[PDB]
Design an enzyme around this catalytic site. Structure first.
Site, PDB file in Angstrom:
ATOM      1  N   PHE A   1      -7.910  -4.825  -2.233  1.00 56.28           N
ATOM      2  CA  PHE A   1      -9.014  -5.068  -3.160  1.00 56.28           C
ATOM      3  C   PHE A   1      -9.321  -6.548  -3.167  1.00 56.28           C
ATOM      4  O   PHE A   1     -10.482  -6.950  -3.149  1.00 56.28           O
ATOM      5  CB  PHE A   1      -8.676  -4.618  -4.584  1.00 56.28           C
ATOM      6  CG  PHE A   1      -8.994  -3.179  -4.853  1.00 56.28           C
ATOM      7  CD1 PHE A   1      -8.035  -2.188  -4.655  1.00 56.28           C
ATOM      8  CD2 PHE A   1     -10.268  -2.804  -5.277  1.00 56.28           C
ATOM      9  CE1 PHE A   1      -8.329  -0.839  -4.872  1.00 56.28           C
ATOM     10  CE2 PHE A   1     -10.579  -1.452  -5.499  1.00 56.28           C
ATOM     11  CZ  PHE A   1      -9.601  -0.468  -5.293  1.00 56.28           C
TER      12      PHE A   1
ATOM     13  N   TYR B   1      -3.516   7.601  -9.292  1.00 61.43           N
ATOM     14  CA  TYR B   1      -3.908   8.273  -8.059  1.00 61.43           C
ATOM     15  C   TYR B   1      -2.766   9.002  -7.379  1.00 61.43           C
ATOM     16  O   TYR B   1      -2.955  10.073  -6.805  1.00 61.43           O
ATOM     17  CB  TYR B   1      -4.475   7.273  -7.063  1.00 61.43           C
ATOM     18  CG  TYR B   1      -5.966   7.158  -7.085  1.00 61.43           C
ATOM     19  CD1 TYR B   1      -6.607   6.251  -7.918  1.00 61.43           C
ATOM     20  CD2 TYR B   1      -6.744   7.953  -6.257  1.00 61.43           C
ATOM     21  CE1 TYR B   1      -7.993   6.136  -7.916  1.00 61.43           C
ATOM     22  CE2 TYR B   1      -8.118   7.850  -6.249  1.00 61.43           C
ATOM     23  CZ  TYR B   1      -8.739   6.942  -7.073  1.00 61.43           C
ATOM     24  OH  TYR B   1     -10.110   6.839  -7.024  1.00 61.43           O
TER      25      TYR B   1
ATOM     26  N   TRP C   1      -9.205   7.549 -14.972  1.00 67.45           N
ATOM     27  CA  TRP C   1      -9.393   6.129 -14.825  1.00 67.45           C
ATOM     28  C   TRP C   1     -10.850   5.732 -15.029  1.00 67.45           C
ATOM     29  O   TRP C   1     -11.137   4.819 -15.799  1.00 67.45           O
ATOM     30  CB  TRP C   1      -8.895   5.677 -13.451  1.00 67.45           C
ATOM     31  CG  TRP C   1      -9.198   4.253 -13.180  1.00 67.45           C
ATOM     32  CD1 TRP C   1      -8.744   3.165 -13.876  1.00 67.45           C
ATOM     33  CD2 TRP C   1     -10.087   3.751 -12.183  1.00 67.45           C
ATOM     34  NE1 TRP C   1      -9.306   2.018 -13.373  1.00 67.45           N
ATOM     35  CE2 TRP C   1     -10.135   2.349 -12.333  1.00 67.45           C
ATOM     36  CE3 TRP C   1     -10.853   4.351 -11.174  1.00 67.45           C
ATOM     37  CZ2 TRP C   1     -10.921   1.532 -11.513  1.00 67.45           C
ATOM     38  CZ3 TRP C   1     -11.637   3.538 -10.353  1.00 67.45           C
ATOM     39  CH2 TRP C   1     -11.662   2.142 -10.531  1.00 67.45           C
TER      40      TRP C   1
ATOM     41  N   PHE D   1     -10.763   0.768   7.364  1.00 71.90           N
ATOM     42  CA  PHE D   1     -11.263   0.409   6.047  1.00 71.90           C
ATOM     43  C   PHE D   1     -11.665  -1.052   5.903  1.00 71.90           C
ATOM     44  O   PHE D   1     -12.739  -1.348   5.381  1.00 71.90           O
ATOM     45  CB  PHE D   1     -10.226   0.743   4.964  1.00 71.90           C
ATOM     46  CG  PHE D   1     -10.575   0.186   3.606  1.00 71.90           C
ATOM     47  CD1 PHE D   1     -11.462   0.853   2.773  1.00 71.90           C
ATOM     48  CD2 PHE D   1     -10.061  -1.041   3.189  1.00 71.90           C
ATOM     49  CE1 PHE D   1     -11.835   0.307   1.553  1.00 71.90           C
ATOM     50  CE2 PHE D   1     -10.427  -1.592   1.972  1.00 71.90           C
ATOM     51  CZ  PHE D   1     -11.317  -0.917   1.151  1.00 71.90           C
TER      52      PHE D   1
ATOM     53  N   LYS E   1     -11.506   6.737   0.969  1.00 71.15           N
ATOM     54  CA  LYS E   1     -10.873   7.976   0.530  1.00 71.15           C
ATOM     55  C   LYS E   1      -9.911   8.485   1.593  1.00 71.15           C
ATOM     56  O   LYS E   1      -8.915   9.128   1.278  1.00 71.15           O
ATOM     57  CB  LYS E   1     -11.949   9.028   0.220  1.00 71.15           C
ATOM     58  CG  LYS E   1     -13.017   8.526  -0.758  1.00 71.15           C
ATOM     59  CD  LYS E   1     -12.397   8.032  -2.064  1.00 71.15           C
ATOM     60  CE  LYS E   1     -13.256   6.962  -2.734  1.00 71.15           C
ATOM     61  NZ  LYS E   1     -14.601   7.448  -3.145  1.00 71.15           N
TER      62      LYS E   1
END
EC number: 4.2.3.9
Length: 290
Positions: A73, A53, A285, A139, A167
């Site tokens: 994550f 990324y 990916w 987020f 994003k």
């Protein structure tokens, strides 16, 4: 079977070392619940994703992004399994700690990992470090609220993805990782390109996540396949078609801002090229994962 793309993805040069370093860090500190949990963790290769990324991240900053995305994550997963209430409390406990306003309980990895991470980030570049704070909180707060009345039109689905808080976090984290210092005006004049980027990233994710996403959903694949009455293989080909058109839209907006009368800073230029890499890396990916 995806149509040709004008862009070439790139993986951060130090991906190998960084991945061992970061994965290592978590194996040393995160309280995985089982050895199988650990297999699942390693198979995700969060640092590889991060490196695909932000291939242009500074050599001494790319590990920060890997560490941040990894812990987020992990956290996102934790929140997914707890009730809305407990999730609310989880974030409320962690955000103050992330700001560095509250010392961490040294026996709670979710507390000290974030604390040490953000502190070390501000210590490296406080001005940009802080540029990533809010996006991060927006987020993790968005990982609790459920419901979300599944959308059925193409326009509204894309409009929804344009505003994806994840994003948005990526772009901020990217500026930090690349040491990009843009003005408020520059960032504002960047919204269009960013929207287009968020949109492109989603559809590509959807194209590759549709199959596995079958058990019993917000997907451009589902949305378009119904609106057009086409089969999955066909719908996918059409989304790929649009994806390539949005990549062309990206190129036009870039060239337009570069050949602009008011000029285009080197930071801005680097930033736009960075978005290009997010999209090409995301595809590479998605094209080879799970």
């Amino acid at each position: 079977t995806p149509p040709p793309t004008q862009w070439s993805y790139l993986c951060h040069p130090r991906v190998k070392e960084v991945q061992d370093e970061v994965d290592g860090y978590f194996l040393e500190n995160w309280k995985f619940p089982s050895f199988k949990a650990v297999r699942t963790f390693l198979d995700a290769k969060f640092s590889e994703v991060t490196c695909l990324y932000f291939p242009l991240a500074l050599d001494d900053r790319i590990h920060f992004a890997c560490r941040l995305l990894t812990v987020l994550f992990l956290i996102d997963d934790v929140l997914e399994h707890m009730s809305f209430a407990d999730g609310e409390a989880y974030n409320n406990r962690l955000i103050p700690i992330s700001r560095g306003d509250v010392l961490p309980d040294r026996t709670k990895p979710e507390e000290f990992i974030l604390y040490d991470l953000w502190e070390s980030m501000r210590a490296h570049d406080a001005e940009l470090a802080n540029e990533v704070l809010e996006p991060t909180f927006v987020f993790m707060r968005a990982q609790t609220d459920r419901a979300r009345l599944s959308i059925h039109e193409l326009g509204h689905y894309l409009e929804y993805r344009e505003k994806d808080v994840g994003k948005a976090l990526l772009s901020a984290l990217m500026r930090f990782s690349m040491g990009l210092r843009l003005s408020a005006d520059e960032l504002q004049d960047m919204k269009a390109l960013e929207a287009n980027c968020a949109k492109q990233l989603s559809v590509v994710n959807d194209i590759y996540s549709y199959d596995k996403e079958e058990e019993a959903l917000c997907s451009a694949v589902k949305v378009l396949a119904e609106e057009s009455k086409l089969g999955i293989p066909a719908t996918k080909r059409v989304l790929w078609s649009m994806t390539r058109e949005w990549e062309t839209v990206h190129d036009e907006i870039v060239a337009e801002k570069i050949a602009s009368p008011d000029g285009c800073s080197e930071a801005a230029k680097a930033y736009m090229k960075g978005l290009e890499y997010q999209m090409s890396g995301n595809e590479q990916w998605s094209k080879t994962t799970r």
